[PDB]
């Protein structure tokens, strides 16, 4: 079902010229910016041209078939819906703040941990959702695909490479493959030292082939002890970056993780966090 606009609990009979187009928005690649004339809404509307690429158009429609089907799940962008014009298709995603990768940049230093462990729980309940509801791997974690917003919410971007990646973040058995959700721990871990830190674990890094290096020569990058991290963060860590993935553990016992357990019942407000934030801007 196309041509229709479900934000919240009301389905809207919706059109291409409904939206009122306010901009382009910047992020992986083409995403607008709209506002929906007859409800005022904000969303997220991407373009996928007919004449495009074949190769672009497959990814798009490849995490599109996965975020159609991934509606009962909080940790996922949401589709509002889809139109199918005579020479273009208009996803309608729900509209977010930013990514953690700009948040890193906005911030110029560290993450607090409260937060990342608020996004820790929604990124591995995420991934653990496309694993089992779906059979899906993300293969492309990173701090560029993970979402915020005002109201606090943290979810998981696109996979326009999942099967049922990029080279910084890419799992030790991902390089050297003997003979694998699994893969995408070691991704998550490195983005969690990433944001902790505010600075990318292997740095002085000119080739994509010596980030490879370090990855299997040098040992995993945990976290500092001179931060304040807690234990239960630093044992998270260490666990997701562990190098023989026959030895890394799988989503179950992640969720049954120590530092999990605590940031799924405990307040946080990430609602006020973000906004005090993205206040402080260039
Ligand atoms: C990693 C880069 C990234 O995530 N980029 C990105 C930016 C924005 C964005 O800047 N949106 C503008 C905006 C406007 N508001 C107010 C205006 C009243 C609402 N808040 N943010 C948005 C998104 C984004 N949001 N949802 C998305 C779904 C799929 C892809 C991107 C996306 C991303």
Same mark, same amino acid.
Do not use: L, V
């Given at each position: 079902q196309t041509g229709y606009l479900t934000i919240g609990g009301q389905r809207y009979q919706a059109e291409i010229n409904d939206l009122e187009n306010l901009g382009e928005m910047g992020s992986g690649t083409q995403v607008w910016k709209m506002?929906?004339?007859?409800?005022?809404h904000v969303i997220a509307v991407k373009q996928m041209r007919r004449s495009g690429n074949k190769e672009e158009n497959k990814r798009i429609l490849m995490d599109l078939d996965v975020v159609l089907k991934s509606?009962?799940?909080?940790?996922i962008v949401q589709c509002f819906g889809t139109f199918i014009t005579n020479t273009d298709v208009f996803i309608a995603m729900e509209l977010m703040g930013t990514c953690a990768e700009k948040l890193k940049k906005r911030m110029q230093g560290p993450i607090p941990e409260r937060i990342l462990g608020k996004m820790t729980v929604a990124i591995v309940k995420a991934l653990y959702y496309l694993k089992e509801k779906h059979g899906v791997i993300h293969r492309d974690v990173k701090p560029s695909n993970i979402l915020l917003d005002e109201r606090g919410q943290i979810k998981l971007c696109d996979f326009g490479i999942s099967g049922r990646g990029c080279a910084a973040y890419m799992a030790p058995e991902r390089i050297d493959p003997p003979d694998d959700i699994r893969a995408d721990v070691w991704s998550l871990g490195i983005s969690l030292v990433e944001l902790a830190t !505010?600075?990318?674990?292997?740095?002085?890094?000119?080739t994509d082939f010596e980030v490879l290096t370090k990855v299997l020569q040098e040992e995993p990058p945990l976290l500092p002890?001179?931060? !304040?991290?807690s234990g239960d963060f630093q044992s998270f860590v260490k666990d997701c970056l562990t190098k023989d993935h026959r030895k890394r553990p799988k989503y179950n016992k992640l969720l049954e993780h120590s530092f999990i357990k605590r940031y799924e019942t405990l307040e946080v407000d990430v609602a006020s966090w973000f906004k005090d934030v993205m206040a402080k801007t260039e």
């Open positions: 506002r929906f004339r007859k409800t005022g509606h009962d799940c909080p940790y !505010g600075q990318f674990p292997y740095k002085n890094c000119k002890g001179h931060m !304040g991290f």
